[PDB]
Amino acid sequence: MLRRKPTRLELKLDDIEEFENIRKDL
Amino acid sequence: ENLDVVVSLAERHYYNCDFKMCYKLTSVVMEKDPFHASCLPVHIGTLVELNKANELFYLSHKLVDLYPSNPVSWFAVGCYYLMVGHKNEHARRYLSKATTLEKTYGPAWIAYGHSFAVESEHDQAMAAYFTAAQLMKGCHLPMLYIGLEYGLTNNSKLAERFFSQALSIAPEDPFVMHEVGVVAFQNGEWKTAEKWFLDALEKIKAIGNEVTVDKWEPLLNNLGHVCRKLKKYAEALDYHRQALVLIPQNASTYSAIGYIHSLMGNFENAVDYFHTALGLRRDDTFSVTMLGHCIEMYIGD
């Protein structure tokens, strides 16, 4: 019986796509 | 004077994540037999979950003074170096010192893998979880962790198997739902990430309510990532704000918030959050590369 801290999300660089698609579009 | 019936109910509050209760159920048994072999593995876990770094420090190092024969004693002190550390190298060294003293001692195999699983050594954590699932049958935890480790490695089809096996045991486990949305998110299925994270929150919140926020915060950080990904920028910000109330010195949450603003077009205000994030974590590979986009554009008014 032992648990490991709930996996926490962190920012990848690939995540910068969102910002890329924002202007490329707009 | 019959106390083995307790260790069943206290074991149930540990699988259903009602820790405050289980702990007062075990201290009862523990007030009788401290070297209770089937109860100790439970009361040790609950301290860890509750962050009794104090109790566990005293307990773990005592069991080793007067009981260097029972594997539980190095499972203890190992569980100790896992909740705090970062003497990670030690933990693995103590937990293997329990396996090679009673290889059929499952609890030390789950803590053993957790030691590879934090250092990223997926092959070797995995192997430990599959040995624990043999030694602790009926228990869902080893299966919750092999499923996740599969998800991390692109085994989305084998990840789905162990998540549903673990759900058909402790379906009311918020840490089960959590790592499931967590895996969905990696699959690019943001939409169905939002629904698992919310569900794990209502069960953590109103239900097992007691401020389980100790040794914890993620969930909220996670939800904030979902909504950004779902272009729900407005609802996104909200979840990171709360992750800061919970951990008011986290640098990743500051980078996550500044990144939303830059997606929102608020650069002045974003770079403001991208500064107060390097003030905390200097090695911010992502805060740094983004800050560069923000200025190339300032040179251009």
| Concatenated DSSP letters of B172-211 | T-HHHHHHHHHHHHHTT-HHHHHHHHHHHHHIIIIIS-S-
Give the domains, in start order, of chain B with CATH numbers.
Answer: 1-301 (1.25.40.10)
| Ramachandran area for residue B247 (φ above 0: left; ψ -120 to 50: alpha; else beta) | beta
- For residue B139, the tally of other CB atoms under 10 A from its CB is 20
Contact (CB, 8 A) for B196 and B179: no
**What is the DSSP-derived secondary structure letter of residue B69?**
T
Contact (CB, 8 A) for A7 and B144: no
Question: How far apart (Å, rounded) are the C-alpha atoms in residues B199 and B178?
Answer: 8
Per DSSP, the three-state class of B22 is helix
- For residue B161, the tally of other CB atoms under 10 A from its CB is 14
> Radius of gyration over alpha carbons of chain A, in Å?
16
The alpha carbon of residue A2 is apart from the nearest alpha carbon of chain B, in Å, by 5
Question: How far apart (Å, rounded) are the C-alpha atoms in residues B301 and B298?
Answer: 5
**Which residue bears the tokens 């407005």?**
B234
- For residue B131, the tally of other CB atoms under 10 A from its CB is 20
**What is the DSSP-derived secondary structure letter of residue A4?**
-
Is residue A12 within 8 angstroms of chain B, CB to CB?
Answer: yes
- Residues B171, B120, B290, CA angle at the centre, nearest 5°? 100
Q: Do A2 and B14 touch (CB under 8 A)?
A: no
- DSSP characters for B195-261? HHHHHHHHIIIIIS-S-TTTT--HHHHHHHHHHHHTT-HHHHHHHHHHHHHHSTT-SHHHHHHHHHH
Q: Do B111 and A2 touch (CB under 8 A)?
A: yes
Q: Which residues of B258-279 are buried (b: 16+ CB within 10 A; e: fewer)?
A: bbbbbbbeebeebbebbeebbe
The alpha carbon of residue A9 is apart from the nearest alpha carbon of chain B, in Å, by 5
Contact (CB, 8 A) for B257 and B239: no
Contact (CB, 8 A) for B78 and B104: no
Q: Do A7 and B148 touch (CB under 8 A)?
A: yes
List C-alpha distances in Å: B297 to B276, B294, B301: 20, 6, 7
Instruction: Write the CB contacts of B162 (distance below 8 Å, at least 6 apart in sequence).
Output: B143, B144, B146, B147, B150
Tokens of B244: 């800061």
Nearest to B72 by CA among B108, B96, B47, B45: B108
Closest chain A CA to residue B230: A18
Structure resolution in Å? 2.8
